[PDB]
Design an enzyme around this catalytic site. Structure first.
Site, PDB file in Angstrom:
ATOM      1  N   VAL A 179      -7.705   7.141  17.603  1.00  0.00           N
ATOM      2  CA  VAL A 179      -8.489   5.943  17.954  1.00  0.00           C
ATOM      3  C   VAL A 179      -7.895   5.134  19.118  1.00  0.00           C
ATOM      4  O   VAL A 179      -6.714   4.764  19.099  1.00  0.00           O
ATOM      5  CB  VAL A 179      -8.703   5.006  16.750  1.00  0.00           C
ATOM      6  CG1 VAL A 179      -9.651   3.878  17.120  1.00  0.00           C
ATOM      7  CG2 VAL A 179      -9.278   5.767  15.586  1.00  0.00           C
ATOM      8  N   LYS A 186     -13.127   6.832  18.654  1.00  0.00           N
ATOM      9  CA  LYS A 186     -12.574   7.978  17.935  1.00  0.00           C
ATOM     10  C   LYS A 186     -12.786   9.221  18.781  1.00  0.00           C
ATOM     11  O   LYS A 186     -13.924   9.576  19.093  1.00  0.00           O
ATOM     12  CB  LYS A 186     -13.271   8.171  16.589  1.00  0.00           C
ATOM     13  CG  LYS A 186     -12.469   7.780  15.355  1.00  0.00           C
ATOM     14  CD  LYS A 186     -12.898   8.635  14.151  1.00  0.00           C
ATOM     15  CE  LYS A 186     -12.314   8.136  12.829  1.00  0.00           C
ATOM     16  NZ  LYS A 186     -13.005   6.917  12.270  1.00  0.00           N
ATOM     17  N   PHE A 241     -15.307  -2.852  17.436  1.00  0.00           N
ATOM     18  CA  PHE A 241     -13.881  -3.089  17.346  1.00  0.00           C
ATOM     19  C   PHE A 241     -13.589  -4.206  16.350  1.00  0.00           C
ATOM     20  O   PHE A 241     -14.134  -5.311  16.446  1.00  0.00           O
ATOM     21  CB  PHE A 241     -13.312  -3.415  18.724  1.00  0.00           C
ATOM     22  CG  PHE A 241     -11.923  -3.988  18.690  1.00  0.00           C
ATOM     23  CD1 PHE A 241     -10.810  -3.147  18.627  1.00  0.00           C
ATOM     24  CD2 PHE A 241     -11.725  -5.374  18.736  1.00  0.00           C
ATOM     25  CE1 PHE A 241      -9.520  -3.671  18.607  1.00  0.00           C
ATOM     26  CE2 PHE A 241     -10.442  -5.913  18.711  1.00  0.00           C
ATOM     27  CZ  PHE A 241      -9.334  -5.059  18.650  1.00  0.00           C
ATOM     28  N   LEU A 242     -12.738  -3.896  15.381  1.00  0.00           N
ATOM     29  CA  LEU A 242     -12.231  -4.906  14.465  1.00  0.00           C
ATOM     30  C   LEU A 242     -10.759  -5.155  14.728  1.00  0.00           C
ATOM     31  O   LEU A 242     -10.045  -4.275  15.188  1.00  0.00           O
ATOM     32  CB  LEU A 242     -12.519  -4.542  13.015  1.00  0.00           C
ATOM     33  CG  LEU A 242     -13.995  -4.787  12.715  1.00  0.00           C
ATOM     34  CD1 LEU A 242     -14.736  -3.469  12.649  1.00  0.00           C
ATOM     35  CD2 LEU A 242     -14.158  -5.563  11.435  1.00  0.00           C
ATOM     36  N   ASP A 290     -11.364   7.073  -0.046  1.00  0.00           N
ATOM     37  CA  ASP A 290     -10.123   6.725   0.651  1.00  0.00           C
ATOM     38  C   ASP A 290      -9.964   5.231   0.951  1.00  0.00           C
ATOM     39  O   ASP A 290      -9.723   4.835   2.091  1.00  0.00           O
ATOM     40  CB  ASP A 290      -9.951   7.565   1.921  1.00  0.00           C
ATOM     41  CG  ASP A 290      -8.515   7.618   2.382  1.00  0.00           C
ATOM     42  OD1 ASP A 290      -7.609   7.558   1.514  1.00  0.00           O
ATOM     43  OD2 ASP A 290      -8.294   7.709   3.611  1.00  0.00           O
ATOM     44  N   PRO A 294      -5.755   0.152   2.030  1.00  0.00           N
ATOM     45  CA  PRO A 294      -5.969  -1.093   2.768  1.00  0.00           C
ATOM     46  C   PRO A 294      -5.796  -0.969   4.280  1.00  0.00           C
ATOM     47  O   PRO A 294      -5.935  -1.969   4.992  1.00  0.00           O
ATOM     48  CB  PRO A 294      -4.897  -2.018   2.200  1.00  0.00           C
ATOM     49  CG  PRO A 294      -3.824  -1.096   1.747  1.00  0.00           C
ATOM     50  CD  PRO A 294      -4.541   0.075   1.195  1.00  0.00           C
ATOM     51  N   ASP A 331     -13.346   4.386   8.385  1.00  0.00           N
ATOM     52  CA  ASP A 331     -12.960   5.796   8.215  1.00  0.00           C
ATOM     53  C   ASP A 331     -13.602   6.484   7.021  1.00  0.00           C
ATOM     54  O   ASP A 331     -13.107   6.433   5.897  1.00  0.00           O
ATOM     55  CB  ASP A 331     -11.442   5.988   8.185  1.00  0.00           C
ATOM     56  CG  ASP A 331     -11.019   7.341   8.746  1.00  0.00           C
ATOM     57  OD1 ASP A 331     -11.629   8.383   8.389  1.00  0.00           O
ATOM     58  OD2 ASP A 331     -10.067   7.359   9.555  1.00  0.00           O
TER      59      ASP A 331
END
Ligand SMILES: CC[C@H](CO)Nc1nc(NCc2ccc(-c3ccccn3)cc2)c2ncn(C(C)C)c2n1
EC number: 2.7.11.22
Lengths: 268, 299
Positions: B19, B34, B83-84, B128, B131, B146
């Protein structure tokens, strides 16, 4: 229990109904295809059923493959000598989507008996992804059948494996099943299974889950019944061979019913 | 193709592909890219990408990361995402000494549940929920990221990949070796996360499959037919395991109150059938007071 997802089964059912519409191939596409016929598609699907056996693949995988193949041929013209290549890449993609252990490309190559090169298979894959815009989570009759089985009273697996057989059969014949949605074909396949083995009908509980009356499913029931009766005389025999073995309770050895009964819907 | 995207920097590698943080040169949008290579070699487009793309297209939700575009060259394959600004663990670590104000723990849970209920409602398991895969912005939002390990399930489910979930957040049924697992496995994970936000340490930071089981037992007790029917019938299960009584919840989720602990236990039920649903968790009294706060310091 939680494996029947009690809190989400409705939201899921609704949604797949919503998505089966959006993933439906164009009904009369073969007529626009200069070089290939519904008979040729019949030949390729059968091969895939055979492929599914050689590699112990999920029936689910088979069903998604046909979905990709169908939608592909709805947009792209394909010469006869390349039809197998479309199929292979589809079978490859559906495997990648659905299998815990999908077969390697080499294996997918090796089964066309070197008609196509590894390079070609991987390239078709890409083309199919482009053409589908990566929308590979298409609903299948299987996903409806599985849901329909939980209504059984009681759960009979000659009924279960028969409906599977019947739903599978419809994948061979574009005419007429292309004009039917997965929820509908699965509704008939389940009813026809639940009549041949038991003598019961399409249960009330499902009438209100689906909305499908035994009346609305009458057109599809007739076609299926016809296909079921004609099955030993059909050119393609792999599905019948498949469902002979102990695994699927040998349901393809069973004799189809003579009539189905049914109401004259219209009263003059 | 990516002629309109200038790469700012590399941000990570988690799951398949790498990424990058990028900027759209024309619109000004900051994005996360990605990237997958090929060669590869091969075998064609990875099942994990195929899966992420197909599902993530279907899944439009304020609490699920947004896939913006797919740039589909012969050579590379780009996934363009919103985008985070940072992941939850990062964050959870930053607050190691200060803590996270209840309102906020409460908000982040609520949203993750909203997001996860959407996933399940659309027959998707994430599988999955560590955190690192829960991303937060500066406006107080949190989002599931993801889906490389995600899958679309049938109803009822069937045997899916055993090798699944980050060890720490992995439910007992998977650990024990059951042939079926379902939505609940995602809930177990959020349960562990819930605790992780509260105490800022992993709840079950196990160093192996057996040790993970050991830790879960250390904290929740060693289960039997009463609490969870059939556990002794399970494959990799052993009677030679020790018998721990269930630890009283204040040890060790100290600051958590009356309602939270009710929810936490319900999230951390042994029996997959007993375990609370996300949908059912949204109704829980813990969330009655919820708001949408802004994350404190400059993150
Ligand atoms: C899922 C986990 C992933 C793998 O590393 N990381 C990650 N982080 C993000 N943003 C939080 C972040 C993390 C690290 C940096 C960073 C920045 C500079 C140097 C090193 N790392 C910047 C933002 C982010 N946004 C969107 N996506 C994807 C594409 C949906 C993100 N994926």
């Amino acid at each position: 229990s939680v494996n029947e997802v009690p809190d989400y089964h409705e939201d899921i059912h609704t949604y797949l109904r919503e998505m089966e519409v959006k993933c439906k191939p164009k009904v009369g596409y073969m007529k626009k295809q200069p070089d290939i016929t519904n008979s040729m598609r019949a030949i390729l699907v059968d091969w895939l059923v055979e492929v599914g056996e050689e590699y112990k693949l999920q029936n689910e995988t088979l069903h998604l493959a046909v979905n990709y193949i169908d939608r592909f041929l709805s947009s792209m013209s394909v010469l006869r000598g390349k039809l197998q290549l479309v199929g292979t890449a589809a079978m490859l993609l559906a495997s990648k989507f659905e299998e815990i252990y999908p077969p390697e490309v080499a294996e997918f190559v090796y089964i066309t008996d070197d008609t196509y090169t590894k390079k070609q298979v991987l390239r078709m894959e890409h083309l199919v992804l482009k053409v589908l815009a990566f929308d590979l989570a298409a609903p299948t009759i299987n996903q409806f059948l599985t849901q329909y089985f939980l209504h059984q009273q009681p759960a009979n697996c000659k009924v279960e494996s028969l409906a599977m057989f019947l739903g599978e059969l419809s994948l061979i014949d574009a005419d007429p099943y292309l004009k039917y949605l997965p929820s509908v074909i699965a509704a008939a396949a389940f009813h026809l299974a639940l009549y041949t083995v038991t003598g019961q009908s399409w249960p009330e509980s499902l009438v209100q889950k689906t909305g499908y009356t035994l009346e609305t499913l009458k057109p599809c029931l007739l076609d299926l019944h016809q296909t079921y009766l004609r099955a030993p005389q059909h050119a393609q025999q792999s599905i019948r061979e498949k469902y002979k073995n102990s695994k699927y309770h040998g349901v393809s050895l069973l004799n189809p019913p003579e009539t189905l009964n049914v109401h004259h819907h219209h009263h003059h | 193709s990516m002629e309109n995207f200038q790469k700012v920097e590399k941000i990570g590698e988690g799951t398949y592909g790498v990424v990058y943080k990028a900027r759209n040169k024309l619109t000004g949008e900051v994005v996360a890219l990605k990237k997958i290579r090929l060669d590869t070699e091969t075998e064609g487009v990875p099942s994990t990408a195929i899966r992420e793309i197909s599902l993530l297209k279907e899944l439009n939700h304020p609490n699920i990361v947004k896939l913006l575009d797919v740039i589909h060259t012969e050579n590379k394959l780009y996934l363009v995402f919103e985008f985070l600004h940072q992941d939850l663990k990062k964050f959870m670590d930053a607050s190691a000494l200060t803590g996270i104000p209840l309102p906020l723990i409460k908000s982040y849970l609520f949203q993750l549940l909203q997001g996860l209920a959407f996933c399940h409602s659309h027959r998707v398991l994430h599988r999955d929920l560590k955190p690192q895969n829960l991303l937060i912005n500066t406006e107080g939002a949190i989002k599931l990221a993801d889906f490389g390990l995600a899958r679309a399930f049938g109803v009822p489910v069937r045997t899916y990949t055993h090798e699944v979930v980050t060890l720490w957040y992995r439910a007992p049924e998977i650990l024990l070796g059951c042939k079926y697992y379902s939505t609940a496995v995602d809930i177990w994970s959020l349960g562990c996360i819930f605790a992780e936000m509260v105490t800022r340490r992993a709840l079950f930071p196990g160093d192996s499959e057996i040790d993970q089981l050991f830790r879960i037992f250390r904290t929740l007790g060693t289960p039997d037919e009463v609490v969870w029917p059939g556990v002794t019938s399970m494959p990799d299960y052993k009677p030679s395991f020790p018998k721990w009584a269930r630890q009283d919840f204040s040890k060790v989720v100290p600051p958590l109150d009356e309602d939270g602990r009710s929810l936490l236990s319900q999230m951390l039920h042994y029996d997959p059938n007993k375990r609370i649903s996300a949908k059912a968790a949204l109704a829980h009294p813990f969330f009655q007071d919820v708001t949408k706060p802004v994350p404190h310091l400059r993150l």
